[PDB]
Amino acid sequence: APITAYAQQTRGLLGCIITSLTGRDKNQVEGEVQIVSTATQTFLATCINGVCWTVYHGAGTRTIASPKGPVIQMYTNVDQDLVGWPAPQGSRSLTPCTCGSSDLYLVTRHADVIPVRRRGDSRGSLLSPRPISYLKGSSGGPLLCPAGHAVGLFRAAVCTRGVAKAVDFIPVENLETTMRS
Amino acid sequence: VEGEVQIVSTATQTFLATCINGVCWTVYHGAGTRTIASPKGPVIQMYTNVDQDLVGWPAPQGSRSLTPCTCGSSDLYLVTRHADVIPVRRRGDSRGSLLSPRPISYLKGSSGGPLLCPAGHAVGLFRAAVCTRGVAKAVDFIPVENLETTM
């Protein structure tokens, strides 16, 4: 079966704000990727192997609102731009990519999977370029291989006059590394 | 929710339609020049192409359009009218071999359905089954490129 995804919004601005302050979220969780927001931005967090990961430059060192109040980060790596929290009760976790693979697929905040060709250990060309706006808000999102296993997490856009041609990502290896740090 | 694949039927047969890039595509061998029904009355086909066995009206209500393949993978997946996914190896522009042959009735009513690539993107439209003794071992289809030119 092919990679397919769908999005669902679980709360709006006002609920998000309250939940951010109180740190107590009691909403049910489902899925591998969680759409996440701070008071400054929205990005994504991918659950890989029981751990909910995201881009440090988005999460900073903040805690994640949970049904039991705030939850401190398990992992924090400023240099590899990673932060990890225990995967929220209810989420399903992806597993790292076995057998490398050159054909990657970026899952966006809008639940679109777009082809990406690996051009190195941390960069891939967009088979079909898209405006930077399209990629906005999907940092921390997963880069999948044809099997649905996480290869990396979206970090940066290689923009050219408002259009992203390539994308920089953090390889799953860096996760495993960050974990033993 | 919105679906990309519609399960349509004429007085004589039931088949499928796939909305790609704004148009609800299906096989000429099932619809012909028939119109698609709607709350406002019947709507005429935007395209017809007997040579390609392709026809398409404007996308219905409660539908969403598929995106054409841009990776060009040959590891396809067929979606039947029962929503089963069948992996298919692309042998050619309009040909593909099932990765596991199925009885002929397993691919029935699926004409017009989509043939997706690993990314769930449209690679083509299921045109017909190439069976042997009643076992569908391969599939025939209308690549999206044709729909892209026709439109």
């Binding site: 995804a5 | 698609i36 009218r81």
Partner: peptide, 16 residues
């Protein structure tokens, strides 16, 4: 006669 849509299929499985 007209082609009638008798059902729909969401490829992502979205129940929402």
């Amino acid at each position: 006669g007209s082609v009638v849509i008798v059902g729909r299929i969401v490829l992502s499985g979205k129940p929402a």
